[PDB]
Symmetry: C3
Subunit: 158 residues, 3 copies
């Protein structure tokens, strides 16, 4: 895992549209932004049918309904090198305040902002621009021979 100082050196290179204060003890606090956020309104039938989304204008705050999953675009944009990966964890502030998120990863070679899924256990809200996730940077044992080039490259929503 990369320390605070090691992450600080990633600013402006691996982590774009960053905030200096968001570099913590041993991770980076990802913020939610974007012109819109999405509410899943109908279940998915994977892999052929994706969940149905409701597009919502992201003004100042995102209003969430209990038992619904929401997709948010990160403020930060990534340009992952061939020797780094990131484990996306949830900030304990969101965890202890009734929000759920599964652990997911940003792969080496990935480029673009990320889209994170937050599920609300209660009717609640999150302020646009606030920090929601805690990124843990993992170093690969060797530069990967397979960089990311999947369907989400560039920050594709879903």
């Amino acid at each position: 895992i990369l320390s605070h100082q090691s992450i600080k050196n990633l600013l402006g290179k691996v982590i774009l549209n960053y905030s200096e204060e968001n570099v913590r003890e041993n991770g980076y606090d990802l913020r939610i932004c974007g012109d819109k956020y999405y509410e899943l309104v109908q279940g998915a039938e994977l892999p052929e049918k994706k969940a149905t989304l409701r597009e919502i204008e992201f003004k100042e705050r995102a209003i969430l309904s209990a038992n619904h999953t929401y997709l948010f675009e990160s403020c930060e944009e990534f340009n992952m090198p061939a020797d780094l990966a990131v484990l996306i964890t949830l900030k304990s502030t969101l965890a202890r305040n009734g929000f759920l998120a599964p652990p997911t990863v940003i792969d080496a070679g990935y480029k673009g902002k990320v889209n994170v899924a937050i599920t609300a256990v209660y009717n609640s809200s999150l302020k646009k621009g606030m920090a929601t996730h805690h990124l843990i940077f993992l170093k690969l044992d060797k530069p990967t021979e397979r960089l990311y080039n999947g369907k989400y490259q560039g920050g594709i929503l879903i």
Copy 2:
């Protein structure tokens, strides 16, 4: 963390019943399979009373109801060495499509397929054999003096 090439070398040794294409940038995509899958129908009273399960024939697709947790057996079988551990994360495809899963770990010394719990936020479905989780391989600072030999050894469901 192990890279793509390092994981590829684990095929047929640490990862059995594998798919070469499922070795990604810095992890392996676990698939759900098995003759049956399970729906938790009654809550648990831990540790004395486990949740009550409903056994379902796993034909072609698993039908999930909102607000229910389901147990799936992995296609892959594991034979973990004393110097490796695995962090089970959820594929972002499942995350952004309304599925929840908590982070869990496969310990050094563990042998057998794993049983993963996926919770559906919406009425939905998953296709038998599809990739649902992203495995991150962690190296222990030193070979562990305590290999796994717990109650789930061999791939015990619950």
Copy 3:
């Protein structure tokens, strides 16, 4: 990540109010304890308004209602060094029995017990003193120049 033997050495130094038996293959099993546990009863409006909590006496067992998040104080107290961090994962026993928890982290420099959020998918219960989470210890590439000193220092609930 740290092996069983390496974790065992942290006992009485980094991990206080511990249990020898809880040092596993490659992690430590955190226990829930404390005089009280909390039920989130009203959603949060982050960051200005935290969720509303209901304080419950923690006698022998915590009774959980489906679709509710609960905050539990850990038995263990931490004194994190400048070169270590901890990934909090959920024990698979809780995962396969209908409990959800997001991945969260204990930062280098953090002092005190931790407060973990468990969400019940079903009406259920957890016994006081039982192991619920699996702690994975991560070593920082370098001693962090920024130790924890946030609002939760000392084990602040929320």
